[PDB]
């Protein structure tokens, strides 16, 4: 499987974990030291993010990607993607479109998310 | 003097100075050819597009001030989240607003270069 196809598989696993609150998968796919920016402008850490999924207050019905734009930079892959989300998110009901940035990097053969952001469209 | 924080943020400060002064020559060095940036409209922007806006006289920012850096060092990469005050002319648009910038820097070809980022508007 080529590098682009590997990252697209990693993406599918990440989005499946998110949709199913599979915290065990997220613990492996998200790097401990990542930073995420959310629509309010707040910076979120891995701990905070996993705590939200573990809380049971995130219940997503659909997490649908399209229009991937990808750049491969040695052991790092930069991803831009359209994501449509339907479900319950904390005290918000989602039926919305977002543009996500994700940066994946290899850690001794394992791809992990080190940075990203969510922009409301 | 110069402390470790100053060293860590040296390329950040050069970038903000280059933005403020339309230093296209410095932007060519600091930005990686294969970066992707996401802007508030949700558009995905490339290095050439970003730099072309500064080259064309389309951007005239008076001041570019950072605050509230959050930094994570991950092997050959520095991930930065920061508030940036943007004041000036940006195309027809007069700005006097803060955005939350994400930047990912990689130590590549012997220097720190931006490989990814995004700009989040407040409101």
Structural domains of chain B, with CATH: 1-123 (3.10.450.50)
> Half-sphere exposure (CA, 13 Å, Cβ side) for A23?
13
Q: How far is CA B108 from CA A73, A118, B11, B33, B112, in A?
A: 10, 26, 13, 11, 6
Contact A72 B34 (CB under 8 A): yes
User: CA-CA distances (angstroms) from residue A65 to A62, A100, B35, B103?
Assistant: 10, 10, 21, 23
- Resolution of this entry in Å? 1.6
Please give the structure tokens belonging to residue A19: 């949709």
CB atoms closer than 10 angstroms to residue A72: 14
Tell me which chain A residue has its CA closest to the CA of residue B82: A43
Instruction: Report strand pairing: A58-73 vs A43-45.
Output: unpaired
Half-sphere exposure of A85 (CA within 13 A, CB side): 24
Q: What is the dihedral of CA B27, B30, B35, B41, to 10 degrees?
A: -50
Burial class (CB in 10 A: 0-12, 13-18, 19+), B75: middle
Instruction: Confirm or reject contact between B93 and chain A (CB < 8 A).
Output: no
To the nearest whole angstrom, how far is the Cα of A108 from the nearest Cα of chain B?
12
List CB contacts (< 8 A) between A35 and chain B.
70, 72, 79-81, 102
CA atoms within 13 Å, Cβ hemisphere of B93: 7
A78 in reach of chain B (CB within 8 A): yes
The answer to whether A7 contacts chain B (CB < 8 Å) is no
Q: How many CA atoms lie within 13 A of B62 on its CB side?
A: 7
Show the tokens assigned to B39.
Answer: 């802007």
Sheet containing A110-120: give its strands across. Answer: A43-45, A30-37, A110-120, A92-107, A76-89, A58-73
Residue with token string 């969510």: A118
B117, B104 in Cβ contact below 8 A? yes
Evaluate whether A88 touches A9 at the Cβ level (below 8 Å).
Answer: no
How far is the C-alpha of B75 from the C-alpha of A89, rounded, in Å?
33
Q: What is the CA radius of gyration of chain A?
A: 14
For B118: left if phi > 0, alpha if psi spans -120 to 50, otherwise beta; the answer is: beta
CB within 8 Å: B38 and A116: no
Helices (H), B1-123: 4-8, 10-20, 24-30, 47-55
Q: Tell me if chain B has a CB within 8 Å of the CB of A106.
A: no
Task: State how far the Cα of A60 lies from the Cα of A39, in Å rounded to an integer.
Answer: 18
- Note whether A33 contacts B: Cβ–Cβ < 8 A: yes
Calculate the dihedral angle through the C-alpha atoms of A14, B32, B39, B103, rounding to the nearest 10 degrees.
Answer: 70
Technique behind the model = X-ray
Q: What are the backbone angles phi and psi of residue B3, rounded to the nearest 5°?
A: -105, 180
Q: Which residues of A touch B36 (CB under 8 A)?
A: 69, 71, 78-80, 101
Q: CB A34 to CB B120 under 8 A?
A: no
């Amino acid at each position: 499987m080529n590098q682009r196809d590997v990252i697209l598989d990693c993406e599918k696993k990440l989005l499946t974990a998110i949709q199913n609150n599979d915290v065990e998968s997220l613990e492996v796919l998200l790097h401990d030291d990542l930073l995420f920016i959310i629509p309010s402008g707040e910076t979120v850490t891995k701990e905070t993010d996993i705590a939200a999924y573990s809380s049971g207050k995130i219940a997503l019905r659909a997490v649908v990607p399209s229009d991937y734009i990808i750049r491969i930079i040695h052991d790092t892959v930069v991803v831009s993607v359209n994501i449509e989300i339907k479900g319950e998110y904390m005290e918000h009901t989602l039926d919305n479109t977002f543009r996500y940035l994700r940066v994946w990097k290899l850690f001794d053969g394992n791809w992990k998310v080190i940075a990203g952001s969510c922009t409301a469209i």
